[PDB]
Design an enzyme around this catalytic site. Structure first.
Site, PDB file in Angstrom:
ATOM      1  N   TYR A 185       0.830  -1.231   0.000  1.00  0.00           N
ATOM      2  CA  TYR A 185       0.000   0.000   0.000  1.00  0.00           C
ATOM      3  C   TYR A 185       0.856   1.271   0.000  1.00  0.00           C
ATOM      4  CZ  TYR A 185      -3.629  -3.389   1.129  1.00  0.00           C
ATOM      5  OH  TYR A 185      -4.475  -4.457   1.157  1.00  0.00           O
ATOM      6  N   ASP A 198      -0.436 -11.315   8.926  1.00  0.00           N
ATOM      7  CA  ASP A 198       0.595 -12.281   8.540  1.00  0.00           C
ATOM      8  C   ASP A 198       1.981 -11.964   9.040  1.00  0.00           C
ATOM      9  OD1 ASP A 198      -1.248 -13.797   7.172  1.00  0.00           O
ATOM     10  OD2 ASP A 198      -0.796 -12.879   5.244  1.00  0.00           O
ATOM     11  N   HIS A 206       4.934  -6.672  -4.096  1.00  0.00           N
ATOM     12  CA  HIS A 206       3.552  -6.859  -4.373  1.00  0.00           C
ATOM     13  C   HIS A 206       2.692  -5.625  -4.155  1.00  0.00           C
ATOM     14  CE1 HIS A 206       0.645  -6.912  -1.204  1.00  0.00           C
ATOM     15  NE2 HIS A 206       1.724  -6.711  -0.481  1.00  0.00           N
ATOM     16  N   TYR A 257     -11.362  -2.436  -0.693  1.00  0.00           N
ATOM     17  CA  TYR A 257     -11.444  -2.206   0.771  1.00  0.00           C
ATOM     18  C   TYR A 257     -10.283  -1.327   1.254  1.00  0.00           C
ATOM     19  CZ  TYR A 257     -12.008  -2.995   5.712  1.00  0.00           C
ATOM     20  OH  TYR A 257     -12.208  -2.793   7.049  1.00  0.00           O
ATOM     21  N   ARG A 258      -9.151  -1.437   0.579  1.00  0.00           N
ATOM     22  CA  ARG A 258      -7.866  -0.857   1.042  1.00  0.00           C
ATOM     23  C   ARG A 258      -6.949  -0.799  -0.170  1.00  0.00           C
ATOM     24  NH1 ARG A 258      -4.319  -3.819   5.735  1.00  0.00           N
ATOM     25  NH2 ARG A 258      -2.760  -2.177   6.080  1.00  0.00           N
TER      26      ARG A 258
END
Ligand SMILES: Cc1cc2nc3c(=O)[nH]c(=O)nc-3n(C[C@H](O)[C@H](O)[C@H](O)COP(=O)(O)OP(=O)(O)OC[C@H]3O[C@@H](n4cnc5c(N)ncnc54)[C@H](O)[C@@H]3O)c2cc1C
Ligand SMILES: Cc1cc2nc3c(=O)[nH]c(=O)nc-3n(C[C@H](O)[C@H](O)[C@H](O)COP(=O)(O)OP(=O)(O)OC[C@H]3O[C@@H](n4cnc5c(N)ncnc54)[C@H](O)[C@@H]3O)c2cc1C
Ligand SMILES: COc1cc(C=O)ccc1O
Ligand SMILES: COc1cc(C=O)ccc1O
Lengths: 524, 524
Positions: free
Chosen positions: B89, B149, B388, B469-470
């Protein structure tokens, strides 16, 4: 003729015409007889405080927007109800005396959608707990509602004041999922996944993308809610409700300390546990005059007569278990073992007890299974002209805190001539001391005594670190005034947001002590 | 020399001096080598987008207020991190390139309070999941955390982006209870029962009195959080984690339709169920080159080689059960009976499987018991230079929807040369499709292709009613743009509140697509 504060007779005449031009003549009510219907039934100060100048019943979202725009043009303050049954907190009465009431529930009363498999409903404000219960029983019978004690309230309205019931879905605001809200200048917005056109997820996750706003519309004057989603629990395969009677007022300390470890994991205390004193149990099935006809507080021997005659304790615990009969037996076993450590404790199931003293047990068995009831209204026959005002501060779920509050509140109630009828309720990690302060609504002195008592209870509770969760119109300024960390930082934040969203100071001025600029510091 | 947008070299010099005067010379960093440390590790499109002009590390709330007041004086935009591990993000990178980063976590890293009996912590932003786990194991061992995680994240920071873990306390924001927040002009405020001076209930009920605001500080630029409470679950008496392998990519439909009814009542699927595809299971224990060294997508026989060598399905279900061993056996029995209706389904317990293929099972057993891990970082060894970007839309927990999404996303991933590594997660009534789009961060073409792919995935998801969502810094404008019900009513609301609270446009401009007036519509 009641005029809104800060609005000329001429501007009020113009506004009423504009309101009629939108909603219809039938849905703008100004007759004294129709306005009397929106009077607080349980007024605490002057009965003449909190009057409505008019009641407007918009058909739909579009009409809500247009009544809000008209209000902005003429500076009409508008208060808001769904069903307006907020009894104990003002009924349908506005905080700002002379406000125009927006009656959302009269015409916006549709169950818009029920998804049985994903367990939700999309609702309009006019849907009562009775209405939704009837709909699920006919069309989605695997689901159940979560209702407060009285079913005539609104599923929406109750959740917007952060009301509560007693099933595992007891926290109504928690299960609220998605809103449509008309903002104070008349813009409409959908929260959460509803902001995404064509979303299929409005009622299955509360949040959406970016700041989460829904809570800002609870105990709030920032918007008029037109649609609200709520998650609905699946009916378990079976349920059982039990009563534990405890003989001694001093048992409260041990009851709370046994309760917490059994509730905090939501098992074995699977529903919201309630611990009701002899008086709020006795008052459902009897009148005060039945036990005592002398003046002053009820003497101990009157309390003892209630316990003995009705088969109750000073403290009466009610809980419900859910699941297959093997799980219920097992959990009930753990409960009986834990609370049985208290000498004098007695256990009765909803299938074991069917006498006068089991009336509350049988009612809790309905409520705790999402079957709405009006049985608790019999509490209002305790004394002639009975009314209550809500006092429900939040405390740690610790026996020592329970005993301190029990003693503090009862001693003040005794001093102010009000009976001590109260329960302790543990949500999960938090305790509520919900005191039903019963008074003669027809007696100016009794109303004055109840207001004086409640202001004193709030101040003494706040000094002990116990804040009020919900309050009456008459107490909103005081209660917000207790939350004054950082030289009133919370209220200054609320005012900054209120003034930005509501520059003309239109929506429910003074709700939760939040006044828009034009009405703030004017003593109303 | 990186300058904030809209600030003169002179005003930037003045601000840095004032910041040094508050936090100390050591805690104002402007060296290129120190700034490089706050670079997004997984940049999408241009690596040089989202640079910091400086990093400020305030010691405490009072210093946060003074750095915010200095920022207001000189128009310095300030972004915010706790631990700044928001990888996927943007990391610790500001949405507004050239912003000054407020590093709350470096020095505000204390566990302020843990109550074992009432199960909560009061924390500062720098407390990592590792930090809190270590503290509970030493000082409150009946409690456990809920971790994502990777444990190097912030209990506070993760909750403020509405991140999630996998225990029954997986919804971090839900269990957040009370905040202290510095508002955009430097005022400090406490939320909930913390607004009452001397309250004893800050961490035991989220709401308080009046409009409930804590959600407005999540995925938000409305303030800098300095303290946050979080409820902590009691460790159950025992736990077991199980893996269900499913052979066929087409099993997804039936897996989701069996999962929902078993999760929606939070039993027998007691934790957050995750359904991971072969590639995000294989990528933890192997490299892409181990299975295939040709160009184009992974061929089906490469997938089959991963399955067989590692003893994995196309879909791999991980769940945890809690309680006494008799409850675990009973619930596991129901789970095996339900998912065993799918031909080819195989069941392995955390005590039954200990091979290369059981790596994810043993990691989930830690995570699902609040034991933090960095095992999933092995995922980033899939291909050289792996990074990612997060793609995680919400959908109904219905098999048809899952299948639609699986196919849509994989098809586009193939077209854009990215592997489909993904999982389906059901919170309670909602589904998440969390795709890990892996790419070579060192390859300009791969970064550009990943950004192009993700923009396309967001638009196609949104057209099907599936909102994100994010999201990453690079995608925040686009994602907010999809929540445009009522001609963008949601963003107009967020902008009205941003401009009221933040009139000088200081805090994390552009977070969630919310720009203050002075930066809005400038394309950055
Ligand atoms: C004996 C007794 C027992 C009670 N037991 C309980 C109980 O178990 N649990 C409980 O929670 N309460 C209880 N109450 C309090 C009260 O009776 C209920 O909470 C009742 O359901 C609230 O009224 P309502 O549902 O009609 O809501 P309304 O009166 O319609 O609305 C409540 C408030 O929400 C806001 N509002 C409503 N509609 C909108 C809208 N569309 N947009 C914006 N704001 C809106 C306003 O501030 C309004 O005053 C009890 C009261 C008594 C007297
Ligand atoms: C392989 C992999 C797996 C992942 N798994 C998960 C997972 O299981 N669950 C999950 O949720 N995420 C997951 N993530 C995403 C991310 O790694 C985690 O969410 C991580 O915990 C977030 O970074 P953080 O905790 O350091 O928070 P931070 O980066 O410190 O904060 C996150 C955001 O919160 C805001 N913020 C932070 N501090 C403050 C403050 N004091 N005041 C105001 N606003 C503030 C800012 O907007 C900031 O960008 C995963 C990422 C990868 C690469
Ligand atoms: C008037 O307030 C309440 C009353 C009751 C029952 O007396 C329960 C919850 C409440 O909030
Ligand atoms: C990249 O962000 C996320 C990653 C994961 C697990 O890979 C779960 C939730 C997330 O938000």
């Amino acid at each position: 003729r009641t005029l809104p504060p800060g609005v000329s007779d001429e501007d009020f005449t113009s506004a009423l015409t504009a309101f009629r031009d939108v909603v219809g003549d039938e849905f703008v009510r100004t007759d004294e007889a129709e306005l009397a219907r929106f009077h607080d039934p349980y007024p605490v100060g002057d009965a003449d405080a909190h009057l409505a100048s008019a009641v407007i019943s918009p058909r739909d979202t579009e009409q809500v927007q247009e009544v809000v725009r008209i209000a902005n043009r003429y500076g009409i303050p508008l208060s808001v109800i769904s069903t307006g049954r907020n009894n104990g907190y003002g009924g349908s009465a506005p905080r700002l005396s002379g406000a125009v009431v927006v009656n959302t529930g009269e015409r916006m009363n549709r169950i818009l959608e029920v998804d049985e498999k994903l367990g939700y409903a999309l609702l309009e404000p006019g849907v009562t707990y009775f209405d939704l219960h009837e709909y699920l029983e006919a069309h989605a019978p695997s689901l159940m509602i979560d209702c407060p004690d009285l079913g005539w309230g609104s599923v929406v309205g109750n959740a917007l004041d952060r009301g509560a019931g007693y099933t595992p879905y007891g926290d109504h605001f928690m299960w609220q999922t998605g809103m449509e809200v008309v903002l104070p200048q008349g813009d409409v917005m959908r929260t959460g996944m509803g902001a995404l056109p064509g979303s299929t997820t409005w009622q299955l996750i509360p949040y959406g993308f970016g700041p989460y706003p829904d809570g800002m519309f609870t105990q709030s004057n920032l918007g008029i809610v037109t649609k609200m989603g709520i998650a609905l629990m699946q009916k378990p395969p079976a349920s059982m409700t039990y009563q534990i009677t405890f003989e001694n007022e001093s048992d409260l300390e041990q009851i709370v300390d046994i309760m917490l470890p059994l509730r905090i994991n939501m098992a074995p205390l699977q529903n919201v546990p309630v611990l009701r004193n002899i008086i709020l149990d006795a008052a459902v099935v009897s009148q005060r005059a039945d036990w005592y006809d002398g003046d002053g507080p009820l003497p101990p021997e009157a309390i003892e007569r209630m316990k003995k005659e009705l088969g109750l304790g000073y403290w009466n615990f009610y809980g419900t278990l859910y699941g297959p009969p093997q799980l219920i037996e097992m959990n009930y076993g753990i409960i009986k073992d834990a609370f049985g450590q208290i000498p004098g404790s007695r256990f009765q199931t909803h299938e074991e007890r069917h006498d006068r003293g089991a009336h509350v047990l049988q009612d809790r068995h309905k409520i705790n299974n999402g079957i709405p009831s009006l049985s608790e209204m019999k509490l209002m026959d305790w004394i002639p002209g009975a009314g209550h005002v809500g006092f429900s501060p939040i405390s740690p779920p610790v026996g020592r805190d329970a005993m301190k509050q029990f003693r503090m509140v009862r001693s003040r109630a005794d001093e102010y001539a009000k009976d001590y009828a109260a329960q302790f309720v543990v949500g999960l990690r938090e305790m509520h001391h919900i005191a039903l302060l019963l008074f003669d609504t027809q007696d100016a002195t009794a109303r004055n005594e109840t207001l004086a008592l409640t202001r004193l209870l709030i101040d003494e509770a706040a000094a002990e670190g116990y804040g009020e969760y919900r309050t009456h119109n008459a107490l909103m300024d005081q209660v917000m005034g207790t939350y004054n960390w950082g030289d009133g930082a919370l209220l200054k934040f609320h005012e900054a947001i209120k003034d930005a969203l509501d520059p003309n100071g239109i929506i429910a001025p003074g709700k939760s002590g939040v006044w828009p600029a034009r009405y703030r510091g004017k003593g109303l």
